[PDB]
RNA sequence: CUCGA
DNA sequence: GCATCCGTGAGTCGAGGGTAATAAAACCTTCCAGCAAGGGGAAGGTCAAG
DNA sequence: CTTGACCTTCCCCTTGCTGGAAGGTTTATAATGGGAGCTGTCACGGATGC
């Protein structure tokens, strides 16, 4: 009941919920950081991580983030991106069977 | 006076030594009650030391004069 | 309701948990400005039950920005009522449609600098008409301890 | 009701605002055209003759709708609904093109190029070119000035250091950083400098005398060395570093 | 005080400070809150808790004012005291200061000569060491082992004496003697002859000297008394629920005084070694667990997982006393509130809340509402406030009319980011601001905030009307160009009120006067466009002081009419008779400046702005969606450009073309697309045929709402309105590479799906480029105020009669920075005379200005010698003839002003905005320089030297062109020939290097072995080969001393001369010296015997003088040049003077290029290799006069590729404050090589070597210092331990006993005392002379 | 830590 | 002397939330307070005549 | 200005204990070497160690 209670309400992901919107609200849960133990910090990321790579096309937005110091670290998740067994992003697609 | 201080840097020469000299012209007017040369309407002690000094009636040596007279009338 | 939307505004006012929906389809038998009691349909009803849903809004409250929360109904006595729709809208809902501002008439010139650099200038029947005024609701503690005197 | 600003435009490359006030325009049209119709209490179908007219106005639109399979009181409730304006969708990467636009003006009657002939209010005459008029879904924001806004004299000084606190729910003065140190050290003007480290933020028997010499009416300045500077003094003495003043 | 001394602390003086001893590491009691007898808050030894009462309570009521309480020992005084007595801790065992230990270079093994790797197994108890041998087998300071000890006692019994721990460093420090150290090392010192150890002898002898003359002792290293902190600075405060609150050095202090008194108590049970050996390591690791945590080992952590702040971590670092609660702090009478606009004020003014002005005014609103009576005290006139009466409001206007305030926006960049108003009263609830100031605060009304600072007093309240004032900032620091230039809608006003229509209702007409162009505008007969006869009047003021009206009928349009009200007298019609974009307001404001004053340019800025406003409301520019012109020309030139990609496409599919060829012709035919549709929509964009007085088609510049906003500057460029119409250029995936197919969808017609997702990596990459840039540039700054924060004007005239020399800019091309802003400004150093070479147009020293500067464009000068701050002669400040013209005001700057933070600040703002063939221009004459050449076979000259730049003259005398040519080039004409714009003058090759022989005469291929000396290679293809040689590592390893001289010598054999010199010539073989012309061939000159083939970082590089990572080397001294010893991977070369010192050699690593061969001749400061060039050097071998002018050719010319305007006086001042640190390489006065200030070492010769003896000698050499260290090596301590390494300072000016003066302006800022610059320096010297 | 310039 | 190893830096100003975890037992000693209802007295403050 | 009579609060005192606080001293089957935390920055300058 320490290790629990320590980790929802003391951590760096257990953060104070955006309430003055049903929008701001649904896109708060929605939020994929790159922050927190076993990760980056805001000292410590170039340009190389905040960058858009190719394989973002689908699963993760491109124009949803904030602009202040950790830019690029905030991802947002897209709208049609689901989440594997194991954790990677997949996202639908339609089959082409001859033409 | 109250807009630009273009009239009296002109007089003294830089702008250092016209706010030490308004400084002390200022405060005779404040505390120790003497009275202005030029007709106040309705301004605070700084913009009538401000414009004493832009009509030649203010300087260093007359601030000097003027207390020193003042300094031999009170030994008298 | 904005005027010009994206079709989106449907799906996020749902999914989000701001409104009320109905479980089950049928008939409204009672709207107050707090509680809402519907009929099921027959064929929507389980074989060991009375068949009514109650809903209990959620008037004036306390968001964690300290705004307003506040949920009025949008249906009235006596009006079918089918699975899934949006019987409470809630803050920013109208008619089950996410609706975060108001609309109104923009002309696009200068107006004698007082919109200079990125400013607004505002007429008076925004005022007037209560269009933008919002509600914010604070909460003031007084706790008395003990002290050793 | 609101009058903005059209230099914000080329600088910023927006130009979905453009689009959005004609869009809006071409929907309000509609919607007094319904209101103009509802208000002169003609018949219902009337409004099946032109509300039919106003759902389809695309070229390959996907949703079809028809009024005909709609009874003769639905009509009415949703005419009631659409007095204010006709809500348009417009998908994202899917969009209303600008021919749509020109499309949809025309049957509201109103200018195709959007833009009409404004009077002035104050002076009456009228001005040389068309404005844009139509509109724009605004927001407020939570940065209300209410809550910005913020004043101090003096009170609640901090414990150790003796200058005062910071916040605004906290009662505390403006931090005068070291960016301004260097810019008031740049003017010239120290006597501004002394003034806002000793005798307003960190002495101890400077602010009580000078708020004496300001209520007596006396504005005098009177220093005395900070409290900050003999804290320092303290804290390097305990390291075994001797340190003094002659 | 005047000055701040620091030094080393005896016990005796820690005894001295200290109150009483601390024997008890209890804090309080737990049932009562009241300190417990001998604790670490003890009432006894740090004074009482409450105002005059003791513990128990027998005494109080202040008339007891001194007595001692019987009883608990309380001397009853103010509670005031707990922050002022500090206590003392005797320790048990003798333990080491960590300061002076573990840092860099480690000071207690650099004054005992060890090593810390064999300090630190002392101090932990690992090895023992000897302090003195009887028996000299073993020596003085001998590690011993833990099993050696035990042989060396045995086999000597009790002749040596070892310890180990902090007492054998203690006994080691404390048998020393300095004085035999110090002339062994004193004599050893000049008697070896070396470097790598004179600059660590010269340290220990500085060491060991400093020791002696601070008058310290070397055993105060070790700590045997430790001071406490007084109980007021580390507290103990009980929180609002009941919980305490205690600083974290009441843990660390109450460790150490456990593990005292526990070692106390194990002395005293005769325990074993194990016990004790660890009970003294665990108290030395909690000693220099509070001096300085992180350091030893691991950082000792709380209960919160957390490292405990120690003292060393209270002052240092962004948290410190120094950074955030001395230099800045949290000041009184303030406020803060969201910026609005508005238009109605006036260029002094601002507006001001009613409710903040109450509160910011209250104590002046008490004073005067007690002098009227109107409430009988302060108490009952709190009341009159609280209830917001009547009379308040009425008071209020009184207290603050004439009563300025300023207004600071953060961040502060340069001087303009803080400006005093003039307040008025409004209601609302946001500071109404100017729309003018906003250019100088950087302010867009998007919910930005500024602060309200109040001045007090009446001499800041004077400083803030004649100092600060808004009216008195209209041109910048960093420039003399204006920044109250008029920004976006006024500019637009102006420029739609400036133009002209054809047909325009009611052109042709005559009218009277202005006056009478506003009734016809107003009642609507004629449009604001049109063409017109109006009859002005201007006033020419070139009469000396009166004005001249003259009269004349002009044709204009009525708008310029209109517009004319509004000038002022001087000023003539020719300003406002232009279209008026945005750089023509701003030129007609600076003319308004320079010609008439200050009074008038302030009336005329906010006549604009009222006009500016007005008549573009009555305009209305909208932007539809109408006014996005497609070009139609636009779908045959982006089908055209689909088409020729496939022509290349199906030659890369078959076997044509190679990919890399085809990944550059789609770019190549693709930029060129962009451009056709790039020319086309701007091409129909700005023209519109309107009809004629007649039936007609004539063309105006058009009246599109999106062209006239890019047209006058107001918002927009054209590479905007490109993304507009025409289709977006090409866009770049992150890796740095261009994608193939670009964005050919613009923003009107509507991206895709993937060229929207294409169209993010750019503006991502832009994105998070701001968030990391301004660091650095907010970074810089920091370290540019910290170097030249105390250089303040102090004399007014040095005769010095030299400094730099001004020319403009040739590279290249055109000229980039012309004479007449380049050289205005400042003083003249030498009278320049005209191009007839008599005649002295300028005196020696005058002012160069305006009405000085265009008399000189007149005329052909080109090079005029200024003074320059880099070279000015006074002490500790520059002159002000030396310095030049004030840039904010505009006359010679005066004595009281602070240059280097306006320079520093000047420089450091604009740094968030930054990130063959010889064919001549036009048709002039041609100059060379230091050139040797002879003709060629052909009739044409070539060049045999290095130095040589071809310089273009014009017809009247100044360099247009300056063109490199390098050695071994064949030109087309001769020395001094006219030519024509676009010829070619000189023919080389890019890829080689030839070696030209200039002899007339027979070759003879000598001395060359082929197989042991050179190679073979014979030309596969044509045959005409020769005797060559292989390269440095390929070639034999057995013929490398044995140099191959292809000496040429003629048919019989005889040593051809060298021309003009008798000695004979050779041409030596360096690697891959392939020869071409066969042997026994008679040449010419100008035959070929050979041909060898072969942003802001910038700046803090440049500031930082970083030696760079492959440096162009230079030649030391001048002479002739051979290989010496051989490739042990680097061969040597001696330069031989052909009149000097021959023996000087050097070292060359990879023999890349060599521009000098085994046989040519250099100069000092020439290149030997090729590339960048450090700084270092160019002081070294070049003079002073070439680093300050390589440093403002280069750092301007980051400023000025991205259109950012600095004037090149604010460089030369940091330039200045780098070469501070001098050198001596002679003796006489001081010492052999020890680096002292310039300033010191100048004072000394123009003390001694002029009337106490002869010339006993002080030359010196200047030493250039990076500004991370030139401020880390000044003279006052303070200066350098709040910018950066605390420790370290603060160590260095401790066992030296350095005494601070406070000179600069950074630590009378600390103190709180008035800075030597501006109006305190005037009251300073009053301070100085009186002393 | 999230947000604003 | 030169590859390698370690120390010290890395923009400013404002909001809001916060302010926690758990660990022997029998024996002895001296000293102080309190409690069933007052009694006693000492160092200061008022009253009513004279 | 004077004298005795009355007031005030406050500190000490009366038995037959009892309750509590703060401190010190032992106890005997056999127990014999810790564990938490760090890894996703880059660029120098300059000690240092064969
Ligand atoms: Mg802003
Ligand atoms: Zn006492
Ligand atoms: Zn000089």
Known sequence: SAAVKEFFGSSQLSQFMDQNNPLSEITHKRRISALGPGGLTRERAGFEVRDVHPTHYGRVCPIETPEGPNIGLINSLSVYAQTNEYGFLETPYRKVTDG | ARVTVQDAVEKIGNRFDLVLVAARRARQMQVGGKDPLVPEENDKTTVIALREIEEGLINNQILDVRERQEQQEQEA | KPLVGTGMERAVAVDSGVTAVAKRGGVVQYVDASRIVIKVNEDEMYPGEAGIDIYNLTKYTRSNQNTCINQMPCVSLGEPVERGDVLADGPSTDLGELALGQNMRVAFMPWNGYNFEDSILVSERVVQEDRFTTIHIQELACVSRDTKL | DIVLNPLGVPSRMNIGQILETHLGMAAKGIGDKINAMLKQQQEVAKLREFIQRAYDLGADVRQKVDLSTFSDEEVMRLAENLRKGMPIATPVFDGAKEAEIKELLKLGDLPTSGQIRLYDGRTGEQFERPVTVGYMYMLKLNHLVDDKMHARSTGSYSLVTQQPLGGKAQFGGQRFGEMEVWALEAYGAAYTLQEMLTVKSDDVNGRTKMYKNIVDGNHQMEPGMPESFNVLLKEIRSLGINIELE | FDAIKIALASPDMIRSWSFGEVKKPETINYRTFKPERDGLFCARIFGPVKDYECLCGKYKRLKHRGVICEKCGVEVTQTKVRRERMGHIELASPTAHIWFLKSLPSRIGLLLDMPLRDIERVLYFESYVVIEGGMTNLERQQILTEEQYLDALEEFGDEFDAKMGAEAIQALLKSMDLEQECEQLREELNETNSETKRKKLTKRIKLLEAFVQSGNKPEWMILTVLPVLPPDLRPLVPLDGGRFATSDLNDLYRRVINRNNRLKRLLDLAAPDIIVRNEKRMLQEAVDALLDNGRRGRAITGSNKRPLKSLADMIKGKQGRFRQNLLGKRVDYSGRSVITVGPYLRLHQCGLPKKMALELFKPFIYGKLELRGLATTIKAAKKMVEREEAVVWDILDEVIREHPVLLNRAPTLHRLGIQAFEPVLIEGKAIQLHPLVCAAYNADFDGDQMAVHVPLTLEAQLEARALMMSTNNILSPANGEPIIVPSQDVVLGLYYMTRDCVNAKGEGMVLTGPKEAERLYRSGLASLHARVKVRITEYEKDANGELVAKTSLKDTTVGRAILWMIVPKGLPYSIVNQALGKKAISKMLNTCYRILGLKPTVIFADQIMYTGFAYAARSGASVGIDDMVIPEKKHEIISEAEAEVAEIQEQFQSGLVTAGERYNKVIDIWAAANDRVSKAMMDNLQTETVINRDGQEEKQVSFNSIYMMADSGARGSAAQIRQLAGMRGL?????????????????????????????????????????????????????????????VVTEDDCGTHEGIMMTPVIEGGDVKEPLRDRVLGRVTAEDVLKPGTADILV????????????????????????????????????????????????????????????????????????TSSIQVKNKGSIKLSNVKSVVNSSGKLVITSRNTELKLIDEFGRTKESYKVPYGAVLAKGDGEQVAGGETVANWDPHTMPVITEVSGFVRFTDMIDGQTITRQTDELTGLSSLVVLDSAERTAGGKDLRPALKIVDAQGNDVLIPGTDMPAQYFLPGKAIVQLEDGVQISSGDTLARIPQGLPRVADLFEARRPKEPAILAEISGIVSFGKETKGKRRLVITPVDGSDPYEEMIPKWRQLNVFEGERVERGDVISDGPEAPHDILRLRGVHAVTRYIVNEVQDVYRLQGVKINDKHIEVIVRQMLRKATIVNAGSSDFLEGEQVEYSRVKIANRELEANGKVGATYSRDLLGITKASLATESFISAASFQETTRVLTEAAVAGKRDELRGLKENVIVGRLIPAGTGYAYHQDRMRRR
């Open chain 5, 731 to 791: 866009m770049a995936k992150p890796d740095g590479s261009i994608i193939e197919t670009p964005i050919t969808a613009n923003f009107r017609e509507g991206l895709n799906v993937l060229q929207y997702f294409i169209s993010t990596h750019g503006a991502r990459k832009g994105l998070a480029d701001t968030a990391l840039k301004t660091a650095n540039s907010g970074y810089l700054t920091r370290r540019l105020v910290d170097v030249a924060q105390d250089l």
């Open chain 5, 843 to 914: 005196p020696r020293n005058t002012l160069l200005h305006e009405q000085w500067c265009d008399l000189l464009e007149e005329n052909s000068v080109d090079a005029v010698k200024v003074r320059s701050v880099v070279s000015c002669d006074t002490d500790f400040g520059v002159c002000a003839h030396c310095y030049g013209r004030d840039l904010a005001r505009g006359h010679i700057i005066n004595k009281g002003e602070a240059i280097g933070v306006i320079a520093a600040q000047s420089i450091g703002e604009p740094g968030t905005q930054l």
